[PDB]
Amino acid sequence: QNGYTYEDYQDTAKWLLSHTEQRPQVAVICGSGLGGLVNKLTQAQTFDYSEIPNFPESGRLVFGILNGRACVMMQGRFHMYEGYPFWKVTFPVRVFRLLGVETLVVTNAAGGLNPNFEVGDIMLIRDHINLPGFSGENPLRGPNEERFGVRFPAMSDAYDRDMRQKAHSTWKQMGEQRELQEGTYVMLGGPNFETVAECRLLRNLGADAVGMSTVPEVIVARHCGLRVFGFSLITNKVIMDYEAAQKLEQFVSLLMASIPV
Amino acid sequence: QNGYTYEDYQDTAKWLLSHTEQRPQVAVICGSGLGGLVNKLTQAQTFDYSEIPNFPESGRLVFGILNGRACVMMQGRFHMYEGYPFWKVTFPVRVFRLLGVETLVVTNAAGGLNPNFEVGDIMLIRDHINLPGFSGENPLRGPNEERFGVRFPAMSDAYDRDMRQKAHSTWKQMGEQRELQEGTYVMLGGPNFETVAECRLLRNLGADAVGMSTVPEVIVARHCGLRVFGFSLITNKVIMDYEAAQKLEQFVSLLMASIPV
Amino acid sequence: QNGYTYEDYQDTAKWLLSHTEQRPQVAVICGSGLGGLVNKLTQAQTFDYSEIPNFPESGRLVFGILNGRACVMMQGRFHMYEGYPFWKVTFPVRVFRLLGVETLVVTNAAGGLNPNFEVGDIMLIRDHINLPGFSGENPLRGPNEERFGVRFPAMSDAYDRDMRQKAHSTWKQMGEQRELQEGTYVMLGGPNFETVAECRLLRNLGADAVGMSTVPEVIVARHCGLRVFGFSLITNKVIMDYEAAQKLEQFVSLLMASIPV
Ligand SMILES: Nc1nc2c(ncn2CCCCC(F)(F)P(=O)(O)O)c(=O)[nH]1
Ligand SMILES: Nc1nc2c(ncn2CCCCC(F)(F)P(=O)(O)O)c(=O)[nH]1
Ligand SMILES: Nc1nc2c(ncn2CCCCC(F)(F)P(=O)(O)O)c(=O)[nH]1
Ligand SMILES: [Mg+2]
Ligand SMILES: [Mg+2]
Ligand SMILES: [Mg+2]
Ligand SMILES: [Zn+2]
Ligand SMILES: [Zn+2]
Ligand SMILES: [Zn+2]
Secondary structure (H helix, E strand, O other), X not given: OOOOOHHHHHHHHHHHHHHOOOOOOEEEEEOOOOHHHHHHOEEEEEEEHHHOOOOOOOOEEEEEEEOOEEEEEEEOOOOHXXXXXXXXXXXXXXXXXXXXXXXXXXXXXXXXXXXXXXXXXXXXXXEEEXXXXXXXXXXXXXXXXXXXXXXXXXXXXXXXXXXXXXXXXXXXXXXXXXXXXXXXXXXXXXXXXXXXXXXXXXXHOOOOEEEOOOHHHHHHHHHOOOEXXXXXXXXXXXXXXXXXXXXXHHHHHHHHHHOOO | OOOOXXXXXXXXXXXXXXXXXXXXXXXXXXXXXXXXXXXXXXXEEEEEHHHOOOXXXXXXXXXXXXOOEEEEEEEOOOOHHHOOOHHHHOHHHHHHHHHOOOEEEEEEEEEEOOXXXXXXXXXXXXXXXXXXXXXXXXXXXXXXXXXXXXXXXXXXXXXXXXXXXXXXXXXXXXXOOOOOEEEEEEEOOOOOOOOHHHHHHHHHOOOOEEEOOOHHHHHHHHHOOOEXXXXXXXXEEOOOOOOOHHHHHHHHHHHHHHOOX | OOOOOHHHHHHHHHHXXXXXXOOOOEEEEEOOOOHHHHHHOXXXXXXXXXXOOOOOOOOEEEEEEEXXXXXXXXXXXXXXHHOXXXXXXXXXXXXXXXHOOOXXXXXXXXXXXXXXXXXXXXXXXXXXXXXXXXXXXXXXXXXXXXXXXXOOOOOOOOOOHHHHHHHHHHHHHOOOOOOOEEEEEEEOOOOOOOOHHHHHHHHHOOOOEEEOOOHHHHHHXXXXXXXXXXXXXXXXXXXXXXXXXXXXXXXXXXXXXXXXO
């Protein structure tokens, strides 16, 4: 049961509003290996998660201006595999909503299931498969809070098309030799890596990349009306048979200018 | 852990037996949009769930005679997405068993995965896929109570063939232009609606319709020996690619006469 | 949340080390119908689970020498369907590690999904599919204990190849008419048996046999560095459409001699 009341989000949000003059419209959640993205922020202000009332423990929240856009960034995220229920993993997203954030950018490291993928590739997330969600492990599980969103939110249009279009055209302006990949991200609980049988299984379900986060954050963001778009850094080609983080940082930085104000 | 002792079911059952002279042999569980089915009951008696000891909160239980058959009807059901564990969602089924009920009729609103389905269609449930059940979210999870059923109940014959046969022949007597659909119902936790990738995934698993209930009720009913049959009201054709409630009420009403006594 | 501290495993392990002179290098986990495997032990010593501090309740642990190899055997195992979280189901594996065990042999009764399987067949487990694991129901869920293993353990090489090779050559020396089967074991929560739609679904995921255990034990064993190999006794051919325990005991006994010392 969600151990957070509506007021808890509000308290946390007002705490942040009074401790920084920063008023972000964009929020970015970074997983593992994308910490250099926070060093590009100007007029930056960092808050350790441990100093923010109600924030899940263990990692920091960095406010600042990235390529002209005011944003708030999660340096380190939460995972189901660490033991947190999704209502803790996604706590920050609802706080962002209360801060006035309108767009959420999600990033993650993932295993490439699509044969055509190569290490270091950047896959624009066009869709996702939420396996934990099939069994009820859903961040929206429990009473619905109308002040956030509706009881039965649609997820088919989760990854904003306009931003995905900007992403492609922006990538083209970067003059990259490798095309910007695009595909379906499947989330699994973890923490162990998949077996061959499971890897094949996932590929046949239509997934292009596999990871252990993001989906719950996206679901909660869509529920509370945030515009969403994200990317997966293919850190390794998953083996289907028996026997670049810097570029992503630059890319997300450039996209700020393409996000509608 | 099932927060109900065997005695809790018994207490609830005797409470109901002493508050109504009605002695139902058939139980009907209605989801959303099938409330007019309760208005067809004669010599009806309603109990709000809140006045019945032990009943899960938030909705009423209506006793009465439907087309000559004495039955008990759930107007409003419980869902995993609301936060209830399956032992609460399925609490009523075991109570029905203790009331002397022999047949359970389940109904639900569902999304059509089968391309040949049309809005308003009525799909006789021939089989189901219990996704939450694959991860252990099972209403039978925990110590087995032999006074109800066996430890490892078979589910392959869950939807009574004889009733499915009656359903088809009865539908034919109704002179309906649209054929009575038949297929596999897949249950997901919810509450968000599926993405395109998930919708395709489900269709490839062999599911004809998708919903957020019923399966746990059917499993518990089969476990305690109840005869089962049900229907899905296809309220919308699910989109598989990127870019009638009154009739059901009449149908279930007519089928009472086909249920063996 | 894992209700066991590192010290709990240690306490249990030292308790056993001081109550028997036996110092096993191999551990065997037996499910249902493989109890005669314990009667082949010499210089045997039995401990009821109920007399071992910290051991999950309801079944015994038998130490002894099997075909020249000192081993510890679980006669009766734990299942998710009984209500235990995986940290209780897999408690013994970590204890074995602390006892100095290096190899874990897992056995189970399973339903045959592969059409070519026959009742009584013995399927060497080459790989597995962990459905509960896709939703987070993972024995490794929670903080990682480095004294056991790494945060993100690989599972693709879970079933030791060398032992699988020994298994085949050993089976050939047995002069059995039926070949030693080999395949992928898929674990589901249970306790109900699958429907036709689910059975087909599982087969299409690439599973050869279906059961309700083993996978969590294997995962924890691999996490703490144990060599693993196992077998599934096909007790029945699963019906895919709508309408030997003694040999296994002998086989596992013979394989002791093939396990590296
Ligand atoms: N399931 C799975 N996950 C893989 C794989 N490779 C990398 N990750 C990513 C590891 C987790 C990444 C993260 F969760 F930490 P994140 O926060 O960066 O998303 C893989 O093969 N399978
Ligand atoms: N998963 C899923 N469910 C869908 C869909 N359309 C209607 N429902 C039914 C909504 C829930 C119905 C109910 F649970 F409330 P019930 O009680 O009527 O079954 C769909 O596309 N996907
Ligand atoms: N899911 C599933 N399991 C089946 C089937 N047949 C036997 N078991 C094995 C029954 C459980 C075995 C056990 F868990 F008790 P174990 O300890 O022997 O592994 C089947 O068709 N489906
Ligand atoms: Mg704190
Ligand atoms: Mg009450
Ligand atoms: Mg004890
Ligand atoms: Zn202050
Ligand atoms: Zn009274
Ligand atoms: Zn003693």
